[PDB]
């Protein structure tokens, strides 16, 4: 069309500024109703593609890889995702001591599954698809793909002819989705402009005071996470870090602007295609990654728990701090669903951190974080989306 | 089977008489529980086919036409649909002055979007399909069809092979639906018999009095609409009017008997196929037409607003009358959904006509219209369905 | 893997014993939360496959059989299913006089559709699939299959090419489900172990007393049903009874263990494939059979009505007894849906048997049956699943 | 025997609804006289 | 007066407890919520 990747940067910088201006003069609503819609439409289109592209891609990927292999890749990636997720909150806490974000806050307070695994097996695969539901889709999509392999090896040609057909056909759909992700991308500059403008209009005005301290703490945390873990692990597995960022650029910017791992999945999955990773590998991991792995979100969980505990002048035993890591890692898997999951998890860490949300001051401090949540979420997600790409590139390198 | 198109006329004439008899003797319920079901079953079958036939046909159509072309055809048709819709209410009003339907009615009364466009983009195409949802389907079906074109041009043969497959396969389904629409048609005589019998049993008994005047006004309005606009525009674009009616006959009769533009879409879409219009053209316009364009319904909206305003001896400023047109045109697009949309729109024109529905006399008059709604709706729909066919034949002629 | 069919028997015998032990010591809950889940996962997997495997298989079957033929086979099987169902309750009653199960129970009590056919026609085929809904699926699947035949006879090759494709592709999916049903089967021994263990834990402890008498009466009833009707009708149609049981063995054991006709439908449909019955025949009848025909459940309905009527010392006129048969046969078709349908039907026979459930003693006796319901349901289902297989083998023999 | 659900039956009913107070005023003044009268008569019998 | 003349429109188509209630169960409750009849009863 015109510039194109700049087009996005022009829109992002220009937007986040125009929004910050508009917001300061109390036009946040004016934006919301006039500007924000154009952003939605971007997210809309992306969502749309997810379900076919996840489904179709995985059948094909799973068909054209060995079974034990997924086994490998699965175990690898699951083990990966957890180490990065666990490590990432520890870097959050480390970032949280560096900036003391709960200083003042001159206020205080005293006071006091199997089913989930079962659910991965959809009872209606059609039903599965139809209502969002990424995980049961992943499950069935692999089962289907594997099946197909066995059908094309079958002695009967009349059989392999149907199996080939169905495969091709599914790939048709799969491929055609990658096609559309480029379409949907061309509207990305316009889309991106509206998304960040709206978020700066909403919670720009908020980054003032001790709340800037928490934001800075997160964002340095994320920047540090990328260089200390992702760049280190990329070098350590013989893949060039700076080339990676060239490739992931759209995935990463879309992730940052939408704040939806799910929503950004077709961009992320096109990036892995263009990096020339096999469908067998990314098709299984990236969608598993959208739901299982939430590194960047788990980082900010770490720093926010501190903001609140510092706020009330809570001890926060060093022994306690590691339980912050454990639960918030357990929480990210548990909140696969990204509807302000970040704030939910937070409410959760406090349910077990011992600080009841019902107590006003605990609420008060939570309230503040709520006012800054998108600003955090944008970052947290771009780190989340890099996390999977990285893992997937590493796990692909081992094959 | 037996006669066949007569079979329908025998059933229609025979039915609408038998129903009118049964009704006069208060057997309207007897009919309802014994006869009407047979009519349902006809509507049923038709419904069923819509979703696949709309979706499948459009992917193929959109695949096998130029992109800018849809652009053209879309603009053409959208512009068309509005002129015909706007014009049609003016002919309603013109018909409404001709017959004064609110004479007596010797009673009086005094007293005093973005989101929508967003919604066209489905977030789950599967979900879209599953729950009725024709528009988001139309969107995604075009997106898919276009994508496919680009896939069959791709340098990689392994690609074009999948794309071809998926295309073919979709057309298989598409074609197969046209197949079934002839099946479903063979039961049309029986189906038609029950539908009109039921409607004459229910609101035959009602066409007495000033209510006949509104009915006559509508029906002449519709007859006039066909000759003054559809026949005039057919000649004016070099297509033979009398031949058109030969072709549209089933589409038209089904439309009249069912009262669902949606429901009648497979018949209408088969009629366009048999007229030899390209799938690229009718596949996009006819389903758009089912929801956007409601000429015949908008005509009766015009005449009914008058019945009510005359009823209360309201001024109805000539300046006011044009706002009747504007809102009722804006309303037909808004109530794409045909569950007694006609009566809903009417309630809406009054919400803005200034006559509150809460006032008993305003309600009283409204009530009367309610009692005659099907009798109007049958007509109004047969005009609606001709409207799209015509538009689609004209737009096709331009290509 | 390892043994395999024994693997199932080892797990069944070992489980039903281990469960009975664990239950007697009040660990029923311990089982429920620790063991039962492994059983679920088995049912889960089987369910999943049903919808595609029913749908895909039938399109193909219906495509590749004559229309009038389904006509035949449908009529045959419908007439079959009813005779077997009617007969089976008469054998229940005959079994109920043999064992007097309402003896003591030294307690007494005195005191005092079209729509359904319409529903078979889905309005959204996609919607049909998506939400369970087997029947409207069957309907549309046949309509689709037949359609396709007509498309491959069509003069235009470009047509037959799509029709072939779509067919192939659907068969791909169909075949692939059969593939997965073997997968799902390999986990059957583990699956079966949890299912029966949980049911013995829950209602083992209950088979004590007059309740054993009803259980025995049912179970002899089912054993008798197989030999007196299924074996007799197999010989009488020239098919070897003992070979049948060899083939049906997985179908029958899965049916017994899950208690879901629906759930066991992919095993049952694989058994008919491996018996070499045509897809045209079993594809239409076995799914119809999962919902229409419930012989074994209707047998225990017959014996339970007696338990309760004996309990209160009700007359139970011999004329009354036949109305027990009629309604309980009408009830099985009516409760196609297997969520404890058996107890629902029972509540229904009493709604019309004259004994109101509201009366405590009527309830009391009902309560007892509720406590034994699974133990009965297991049996009743394994007879239900045999019922269709048999019918299907017989109707297949006539072709 | 005239069901209110039938629109025209409703329509006519609607009209009456619009005049209901005008009727109710009168209807009540006659209602209140009714008891007073009855009460005066029954009092006269004692 | 023929009041349904026109109206040029047409249409075809197709206790013990109460006595018990007079006896309030709470006279105070009776008073408190409107309730004229049970009041009359108790008052007598
Ligand atoms: Na992620
Ligand atoms: Na229309
Ligand atoms: Na069955």
GROMACS .gro file of N, CA, C and O and ligand atoms in nm, chain B residues 261 289-290 293-294 384-385 388, ligand 2:
model
   33
  660UNK      N    1  -3.835  -1.351   0.422
  660UNK     CA    2  -3.739  -1.328   0.314
  660UNK      C    3  -3.626  -1.426   0.330
  660UNK      O    4  -3.577  -1.481   0.233
  688UNK      N    5  -2.982  -0.867   0.019
  688UNK     CA    6  -3.118  -0.826  -0.008
  688UNK      C    7  -3.221  -0.877   0.090
  688UNK      O    8  -3.314  -0.805   0.122
  689UNK      N    9  -3.206  -1.001   0.136
  689UNK     CA   10  -3.297  -1.057   0.235
  689UNK      C   11  -3.305  -0.975   0.364
  689UNK      O   12  -3.405  -0.982   0.436
  692UNK      N   13  -3.291  -0.482   0.224
  692UNK     CA   14  -3.399  -0.430   0.141
  692UNK      C   15  -3.533  -0.489   0.180
  692UNK      O   16  -3.553  -0.610   0.169
  693UNK      N   17  -3.624  -0.405   0.225
  693UNK     CA   18  -3.759  -0.449   0.257
  693UNK      C   19  -3.862  -0.347   0.203
  693UNK      O   20  -3.933  -0.280   0.278
  783UNK      N   21  -4.111  -0.767  -0.146
  783UNK     CA   22  -3.974  -0.766  -0.096
  783UNK      C   23  -3.883  -0.857  -0.175
  783UNK      O   24  -3.776  -0.816  -0.214
  784UNK      N   25  -3.928  -0.980  -0.198
  784UNK     CA   26  -3.852  -1.083  -0.269
  784UNK      C   27  -3.838  -1.055  -0.418
  784UNK      O   28  -3.738  -1.089  -0.480
  787UNK      N   29  -3.540  -0.779  -0.455
  787UNK     CA   30  -3.402  -0.829  -0.467
  787UNK      C   31  -3.377  -0.894  -0.602
  787UNK      O   32  -3.275  -0.870  -0.663
 1289LIG    NA1   33  -3.598  -0.890   0.074
   0.00000   0.00000   0.00000
